[PDB]
């Protein structure tokens, strides 16, 4: 819920263009170097944050992009975190009603049903005012 | 008492000016707040602890 | 929750408020003297006990007044929403508290036998349905300067988070007193 | 994202404190009898800054004693930044304000329809007041709306449910009153209650005639009484007026975060700016 | 006050409280189980609660003896319209204590 | 790789990976890992958030 379709496929689309240039990068630096599969593991184990993919980039260019991926993965839990908390606070529900002050309640409608028992002193104080008569 | 044939300025539509007065439909739709003062939010957490 | 909930002091919320409805004298409320609100509180019999708390304070201008909240001197200023809250969108100290109330809006003032109220009345209906009056609207009214006042939160400063940069700092330092302590154990040992 | 942590902070986190504490961890290890390879500059930045970042990275720590010390006060830093970065994310979240979707009729929607996304479906109850304003003034405007004509309030109201249209333009005190009466409070009117060429309701009295000034009076006097601030309440109020009715929950979608794709598509700029001077380097 | 059919004995069903005290009974004689719509008949049964505790307090504090009753009408109490005779009349409680 | 090791490995993934484990070598022993890693960040942002 916090993310939407297009939001989760972005981010797992972004995973493969990361590791693809990590690669990249790496493998055509003029300067171990990173093997396709170990930089797949790296972009996929800095998202989850399991500790698979023991091998950082090493040319200094694949280490700002290999760093602000962990960055751009950080913002990424942080967010789901917090529009977690954020729907989990405001999910409010439908409220309730007021005392007889509402309009739900002060002018009738045919879905809405209010009653109180017959010959009481609810029906005695309803019916004496007269402000209270529709 | 003649001194101005017009008077153009917030003045607002009252009952009592208007015995006296004719006012033109209002130029402005307004009416009576209450003004206060107000503080910069400074999220007052002293410190991490 | 501290975030969240780390929220100001509630303000005034209209003539209904019992703060003001029943006053007390560390809480000063008034108005310009010798205009429509005297006369709204002067003929309202509910509203006495307001008034004579205004009496004694009313100002004599509206500038003055406004200052007034400014400097602190005044708590509370009964006036016209189109001029209160242009100075609540210039001025970033000051907010209009409440729901508007006495909705009568301005009109040209004339004298009964003028020939011109006809055609002056007629004259601001088509300026209105023409969006003439919005036009002035928007180069003297609508201007909103700073941001708009609301609940939004407050970002975390360096005052806030200052303990924790010192305690790095701190860290440091210590490391500093520390390295020697290592070295002479190595010694040592 | 952003919103949390004043621009200064940031730069005082990671430009000053990041520097100052990963020369000075290299320089602990530096004298350390102890200190693989060698520790260097730009793997304790590495290891420093992966750190704040909820230590996903592989990293290569120190060796010697004091340099883990330092190290560690520097990971409390980065659990202190990260619990105050979400927390301070979420409260910027819980309580948000919900933006709106159309600034007026002088919005490119209204005046030019045709070119933009899906046409704009807006239309207004016709012979009346609404009707003659759009016709006089927003003149191509109005042979937009024929198509989209309604039969009335109630009738208006049920197209915007289902979603035969997404404006109606109308009086704004009858539709304030459908908004507050709404259920769900899904029905809202642009600008939090703007109203274009604002007018009043009126008794059309008898062309000069003498009640004119009576009812005037009359009327006026209500006013001052605050007889009419009490119809206001008893006839013309709504549930929906409420306040707390504009936050909300929101799923994330793209062009939310698309600041946090620019950032990367950055770092994908910078990189190549990088690689391709390295190779300017070598010559 | 509750209302609970009596036992086969004709006495009242006995219980307690959380606390141990014994529940305090009065035996009521108001129309059946069924609503008073159905044909008359008044059979015995057991009453207890608030207003029953408070009303043996007042019968033991100012030595009275007491026969329950349940409202047969089964309303509260109010005036109404007689039969087209221009006049009122009260029902239930108020009319019985009337 | 034994039972100990696994049961090690995922429950530090669960909390916050702060714990010292022991990786797996298989290939298709390290996507399972991997997917339980992303069941450890929804359970972890989970509870935070409803804390
Ligand atoms: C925080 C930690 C970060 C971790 C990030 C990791 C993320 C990486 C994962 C990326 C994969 C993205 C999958 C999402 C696709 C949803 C599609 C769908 O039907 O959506 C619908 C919702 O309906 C649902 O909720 C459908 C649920 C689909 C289950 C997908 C689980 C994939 C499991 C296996 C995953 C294996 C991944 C690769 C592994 C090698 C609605 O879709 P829409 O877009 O609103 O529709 C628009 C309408 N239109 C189409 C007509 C225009
Ligand atoms: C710049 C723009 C980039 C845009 C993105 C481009 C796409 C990025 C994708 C790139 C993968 C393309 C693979 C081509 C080569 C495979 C053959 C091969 O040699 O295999 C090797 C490497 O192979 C891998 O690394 C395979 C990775 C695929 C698994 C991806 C998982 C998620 C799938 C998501 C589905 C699609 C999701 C969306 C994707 C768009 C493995 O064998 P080896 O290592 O030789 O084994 C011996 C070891 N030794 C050599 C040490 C002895
Ligand atoms: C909540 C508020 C406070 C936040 C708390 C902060 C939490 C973060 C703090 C983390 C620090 C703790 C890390 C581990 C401690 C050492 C453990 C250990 O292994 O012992 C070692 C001994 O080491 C010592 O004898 C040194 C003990 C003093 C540590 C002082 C830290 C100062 C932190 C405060 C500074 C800030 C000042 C702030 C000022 C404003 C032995 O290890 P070894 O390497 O085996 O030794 C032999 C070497 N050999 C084997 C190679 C031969
Ligand atoms: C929310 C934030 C998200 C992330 C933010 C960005 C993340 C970027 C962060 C990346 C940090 C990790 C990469 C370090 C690579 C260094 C390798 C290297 O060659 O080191 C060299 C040192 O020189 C350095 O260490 C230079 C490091 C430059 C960092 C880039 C600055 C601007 C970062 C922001 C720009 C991004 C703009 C777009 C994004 C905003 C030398 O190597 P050595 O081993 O020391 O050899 C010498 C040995 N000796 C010491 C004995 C002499
Ligand atoms: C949410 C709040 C916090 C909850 C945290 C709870 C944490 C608890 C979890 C702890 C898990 C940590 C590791 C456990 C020890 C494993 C080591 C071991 O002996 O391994 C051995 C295998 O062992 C087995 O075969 C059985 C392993 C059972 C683990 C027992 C968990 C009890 C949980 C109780 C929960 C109490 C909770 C109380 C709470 C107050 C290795 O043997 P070996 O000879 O090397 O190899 C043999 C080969 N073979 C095995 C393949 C045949
Ligand atoms: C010296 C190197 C080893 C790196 O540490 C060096 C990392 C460093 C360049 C980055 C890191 C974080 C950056 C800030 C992030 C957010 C903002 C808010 C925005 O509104 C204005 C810019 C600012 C303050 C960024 C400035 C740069 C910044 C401090």
């Given at each position: 819920?916090?993310?939407?379709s ?16 990590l ?49 751009f993965?950080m913002?990424?839990?942080?967010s ?22 509402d ?30 008569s529709? | ?24 439909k ?24 | ?6 929220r ?57 007044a ?93 005052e ?11 860290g440091?330092?210590?490391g500093?007193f ?12 | ?79 202190i ?9 979420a ?72 979603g ?54 009359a ?20 549930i ?33 700016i990088?690689?391709?001077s ?5 010559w | ?50 207003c ?11 030595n ?10 089964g309303?509260?109490?109010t ?15 108020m009319?019985?204590?009337?």
């Amino acid at each position: 819920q916090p993310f939407q379709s297009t939001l989760w496929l972005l981010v797992g689309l972004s995973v493969h263009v990361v590791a693809v240039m990590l690669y990249l990068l790496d493998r055509f630096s003029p300067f171990d170097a990173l093997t396709l599969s170990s930089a797949m593991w790296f972009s996929w184990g800095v998202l989850l944050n399991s500790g698979i993919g023991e091998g950082a980039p090493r040319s200094f260019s694949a280490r700002i992009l290999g760093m602000v991926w962990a960055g751009f993965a950080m913002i990424i839990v942080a967010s789901y975190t917090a529009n977690l908390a954020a729907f989990l606070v405001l999910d409010r529900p439908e409220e309730r009603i007021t005392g007889i002050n509402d309009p739900r309640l002060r002018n009738p409608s045919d879905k809405f049903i209010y009653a109180t028992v017959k010959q009481s002193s609810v029906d005695i104080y309803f019916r004496r005012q007269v402000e209270l008569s529709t | 008492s003649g001194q101005a044939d017009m008077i153009v300025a917030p003045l607002t539509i009252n009952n009592e000016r208007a015995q006296y007065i004719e006012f033109s439909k209002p130029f402005k739709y307004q009416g009576l707040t209450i003004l206060v003062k107000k503080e910069i939010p400074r999220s007052t957490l002293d410190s991490f602890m | 929750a501290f975030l969240v909930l780390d929220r100001p002091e509630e303000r005034i919320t209209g003539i209904n408020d019992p703060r003001l409805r029943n006053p007390s004298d560390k809480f000063i409320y008034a108005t310009v003297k010798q205009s429509s609100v005297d006369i709204y509180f002067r003929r309202q019999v509910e509203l006495s006990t307001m008034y004579r708390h205004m009496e004694k304070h009313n100002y004599e201008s509206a500038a003055e007044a406004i200052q007034a909240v400014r400097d602190n001197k005044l708590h509370a200023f009964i006036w016209d929403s189109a001029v209160l809250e242009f100075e609540a969108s210039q001025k970033c100290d000051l907010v209009t508290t409440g729901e508007l109330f006495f909705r009568s809006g301005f009109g040209i003032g004339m004298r009964k036998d003028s020939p011109w109220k006809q055609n002056v009345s007629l004259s601001i209906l088509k300026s209105h349905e023409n969006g003439f009056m919005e036009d002035l609207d928007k180069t003297w009214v609508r201007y909103q300067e700073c941001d708009s006042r609301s609940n939004a939160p407050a970002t975390l400063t360096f005052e806030n988070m200052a303990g924790v940069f010192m305690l790095v700092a701190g860290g440091i330092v210590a490391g500093i007193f520390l390295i020697f302590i290592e070295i002479a154990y190595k010694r040592h040992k | 994202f952003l919103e949390p942590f004043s621009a200064d902070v940031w730069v005082m986190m990671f430009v000053m404190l990041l520097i100052v504490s990963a020369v000075a961890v290299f320089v602990f290890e530096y004298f350390s009898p102890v200190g693989g390879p060698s520790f260097t500059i730009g793997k304790a930045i590495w290891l420093l800054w992966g750190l704040v970042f909820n230590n996903s990275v592989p990293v290569q720590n120190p060796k010697g004693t004091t340099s883990k010390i330092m190290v560690s006060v520097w990971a409390f830093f980065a659990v202190i930044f990260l619990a105050s970065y979400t927390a301070n994310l979420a409260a910027f979240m819980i309580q948000e304000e919900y933006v709106d979707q159309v600034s007026g009729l002088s919005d490119k929607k209204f005046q030019r329809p045709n070119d933009f996304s899906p046409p704009f479906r807006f239309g207004t109850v016709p012979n009346g007041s609404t009707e003659r304003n759009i016709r006089n003034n927003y003149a191509e405007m109005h042979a937009y709306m024929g198509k989209f004509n309604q039969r009335g309030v109630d009738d208006a109201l049920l197209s915007l449910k289902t979603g035969k249209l997404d404006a109606f333009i109308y009086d704004a005190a009858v539709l304030n009153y459908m908004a507050g009466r709404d259920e769900g409070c899904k029905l809202v009117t642009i600008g939090s209650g703007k109203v274009f060429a604002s007018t009043g309701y009126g008794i059309a009295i008898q062309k000069d005639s003498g009640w004119k000034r009576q009812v005037d009076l009359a009327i006026l006097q209500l006013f001052g009484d605050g007889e009419m601030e009490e119809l206001e309440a008893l006839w013309l109020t709504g549930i929906c007026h409420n306040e707390k009715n504009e936050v909300m929950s929101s799923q994330l979608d793209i062009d939310n975060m698309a600041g946090v794709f620019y950032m990367l598509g950055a770092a994908m700029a910078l990189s190549l700016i990088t690689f391709i001077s390295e190779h300017l380097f070598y010559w | 006050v509750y209302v609970k059919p009596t036992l086969s004995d004709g006495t009242c069903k006995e219980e307690f409280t959380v606390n141990g005290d014994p529940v305090k009974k009065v035996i009521c004689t108001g129309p059946n189980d069924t609503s008073p719509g159905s044909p008359r008949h008044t059979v015995p049964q057991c009453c207890y609660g608030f207003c029953i505790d408070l009303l043996i307090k007042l019968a033991r504090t100012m030595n009275f003896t007491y026969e329950v009753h349940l409202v047969a009408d089964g309303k509260f109490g109010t005036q109404e319209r007689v039969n087209n005779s221009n006049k009122k009349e009260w029902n239930g409680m108020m009319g019985e204590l009337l």
